[PDB]
Structure 1
Amino acid sequence: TDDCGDNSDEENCVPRECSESEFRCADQQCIPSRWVCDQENDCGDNSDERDCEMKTCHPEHFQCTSGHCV
């Protein structure tokens, strides 16, 4: 986000490393891993909401026939 007004902070910028419990969208953005396959477009391009039946999810969830988790 811009915090200067002339956007000089967000320039010459390399995307940060995602930490242990984050997931990295195709556009190099980091989101909480809980948000993958939760039925919401959290990356903005649905990069989080795919291959969902090819993985399991945290034991407190129920997994849909389509592999999404609630």
Structure 2
Amino acid sequence: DCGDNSDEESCVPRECTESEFRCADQQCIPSRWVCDQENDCGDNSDERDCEMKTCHPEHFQCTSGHCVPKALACDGRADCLDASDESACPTRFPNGTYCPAAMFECKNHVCIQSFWICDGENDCVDGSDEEIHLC
């Protein structure tokens, strides 16, 4: 804040408050960031031990131990990196499909833009994108 660094050179890490989480660099971040699939603390220590922890009442938990907002469960999009938010929920149409024919459906029960079939990355977490029988 002042160009001689006199405001920071002598400083000791501050104690974290009731809704904060602490990182081995002695940093404080919001608890919500913990296990959110992003390395908010550079050592990825905010994503540690996630499988044994429970989740916030507003958030769904993925098989990988990670939390995602519950409104994004069963929405057709893979919000969990493991697609466990979509893998599990009930049938969506009398057709028995999980995805409209305007789009593409993959065994992860994930629904994907049709043009994505067979281009570079597997847009379906593992459900047979880029397979030659699609290409």
Q: Normalising by structure 1, report the TM-score.
A: 0.90
1:4: Cα distance to partner?
0.5
**Matches of 1:48 and 1:21, distance apart in 2:** 14
Instruction: Determine which structure has more spread, i.e. the larger CA radius of gyration.
Output: 2
Structural RMSD (CA): 3.9
1:19: Cα distance to partner?
0.3
What SS does the corresponding residue of 2:43 show, helix, strand or coil? coil
List per-residue Cα deviations over 1:14-67 (Å, max 9, x = no partner).
100100000000100000000000000101110101100111011111111110
Provide structure 1 residue ranges, at least 5 long, that are not aligned to the other structure: none
Mean Cα deviation higher: 30-39 or 59-68:
59-68
% identical equivalent positions: 96
Query: Bigger relative contact order, structure 1 or 2, given CA contacts below 8 A and separation 6+?
Result: 1
How many aligned residue pairs are there?
A: 67
**Matches of 1:48 and 1:59, distance apart in 2:** 19
**Matches of 2:27 and 2:45, distance apart in 1:** 10
* Paired position in structure 2 for 1:67: 65
Provide structure 2 residue ranges, at least 5 long, that are not aligned to the other structure: 67-134
Aligned structure 1 segments of 4 or more residues deviating by more than 2 angstroms = none
Structure with more of its chain in strand, by fraction: 2
What SS does the corresponding residue of 2:60 show, helix, strand or coil? coil
